[PDB]
Amino acid sequence: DTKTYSSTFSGNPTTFNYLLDYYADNTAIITNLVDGLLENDNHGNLVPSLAEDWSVSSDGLTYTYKLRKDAKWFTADGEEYSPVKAQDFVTGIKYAVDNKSQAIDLIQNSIKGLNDYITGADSDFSKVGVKAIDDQTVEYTLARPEPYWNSKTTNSILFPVNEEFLNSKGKDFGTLSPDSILYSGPYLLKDFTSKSSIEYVKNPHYYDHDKVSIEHVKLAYFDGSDQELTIRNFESGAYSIAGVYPNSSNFAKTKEKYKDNIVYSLQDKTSWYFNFNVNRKAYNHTSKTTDEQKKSTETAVLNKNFRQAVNFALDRTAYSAQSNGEEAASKTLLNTLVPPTFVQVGDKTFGEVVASKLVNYGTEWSGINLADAQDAYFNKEKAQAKFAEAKKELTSQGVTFPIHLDVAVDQTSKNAVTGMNSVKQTLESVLGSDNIVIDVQQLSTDDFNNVAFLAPTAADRDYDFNFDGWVGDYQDPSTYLNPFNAEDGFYLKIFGLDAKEDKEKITSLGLDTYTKMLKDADRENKDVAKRYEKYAEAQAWMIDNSLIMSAMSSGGTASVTKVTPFTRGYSLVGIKGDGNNYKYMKLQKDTVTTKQFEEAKSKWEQESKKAIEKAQKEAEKHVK
Ligand SMILES: [Mg+2]
């Protein structure tokens, strides 16, 4: 049945409130249920969704969108509720800001007048830069140019909501009940039963129903156990797709029976990295026992040669092999914060341009290759030479060796313990345990969140280094680089740093240089090739200074599938461009072969690079 997608869901959905929530387990559902202004085609271009047309002013400050006449709201049973109107986009922003949406930073500094609204005693919302010119016309006025603004509209904080429905539901809006939202997307939510089932049905009156091929989507809850049985459901025809997991027991027969069908998904939008804490104050989780050890570690992590030595000794493949497969460990490798083909810079990839700038920082970077799916960094001799320089500098400063580094893990993630033990093993093998000792702090999930992700302030980060990630949310290198800026970077805290109190240490680390590189790049909003080259300078600075050490992406997982490759909508950012968007997806009767996938990927790489060209000039025609 090529009209029924049957699979599983393994996360715990918590809310359908697409305006206030941006958690992946929730957006994977509501992207099928609610449309925004734009969506993505299968090549990554922004294309019409609820908006059939759009324009931008010459100064880049005013975006206007024309809603299509048959954009409609439906209740979950499929009955028409009301046409979508431009005021619904005003309602959405006011509601998202008044209730402090998880995604508010996407718009707070972007829409004109919004930051003042969130701080006036009675700041009137009619001063905010979102307006319904008439029923079919929504107009956004921005506080500064944002060449990436349209890509933001694929995030659900920018989706519309009908005010009368919103007001009538009140506290019952956007729960886990299908009737707690209205539907404007390709599907209706026919069922949601917590920890058992999600079912979508194609909306036959959706404006783009003729483009929707999958009529039924059935997802069964997968609780993480008994991995050996979803392949059996693939063979029987009960499932359209089946993951192939190293943590399983039937692997042998699976890999070999499906050796010519196992395909790997594209690397997705989460950039994982290791980072240092260079301003540690919290020592509730340490194997160090003396003030002198803590002083030695604090001085070491401030030494750039020391951080680079760790960087060159961190074997990313061995870490990836523990969580994923050792065969497929290389599929997820990532060497930059900004994925190396995230944008093109003229004839070159972003990663090629970053490499050209990075070589200027030192002979240790000569020949560096930052491409995906290989480890750019690991190099024993480079690590040992860097450490020897660091040890001379640090000994001269009064430090005692070996340097002990604490890293915390959630002990309930088996991939996390085995992964960090691999990092300990490799670092100590390469640099020597008379030089460095990695002390893994196994913690409960609650304690692990308290030392890092949920640490109340920068001063509460309780580790010397950590493994962490960033999800990009708009189509510009700054989405990955801005969080680490020294004026107001949201993620300065992961380094233990606060912009005001640690201004001196921030300057001494060179982060003012990084921050000025980002400002200079953001200034370029007419020539994107020049804009992106300037962001490459900042990415190269970050790599050289090794406060962040890029490691891997998400995605890149093995499966057998009946999904015809490269037909679904696709994007690097937003929620309309991942494997959870069934609208453009097509199913086939026969299992995809590795050979078919290779030919489809080459065809897609040709057509995508070309269509992105035709799409840009296309956007030059929308400048009004
Ligand atoms: Mg039900």
Author numbering: 29 to 652
The authors write:
Given the auxotrophic nature of pneumococci for certain amino acids, the Ami ABC transporter system, orchestrating oligopeptide uptake, becomes indispensable in host compartments lacking amino acids. The system comprises five exposed Oligopeptide Binding Proteins (OBPs) and four proteins building the ABC transporter channel. Crucially, SBPs determine the specificity of their respective transport systems, thereby governing the range of molecules capable of entering the cell. The five lipoproteins exhibit pairwise sequence identity of ~52–60% and share a very similar overall folding.
The obtained electron density map of the AliD structure, encompassing residues 28 to 652, presents an excellent quality all over the sequence. Lobe 1 comprises Domain I (residues 29–63, 191–296, and 583–617) and Domain II (residues 64–190), while Lobe 2 consists solely Domain III (residues 297–582). The exposed surface of α19 is decorated with multiple basic residues, a conserved feature across all the OBPs in the Ami system that, besides its clear structural role, could help in proper orientation of the OBP on the membrane during oligopeptide binding. The ligand-bound and unbound forms of AliD retained the three-dimensional structures of the individual domains unaltered, as both conformations were related by a rigid-body rotation of ~20° of Lobe 1 (Domain III) relative to Lobe 2 (Domains I and III).
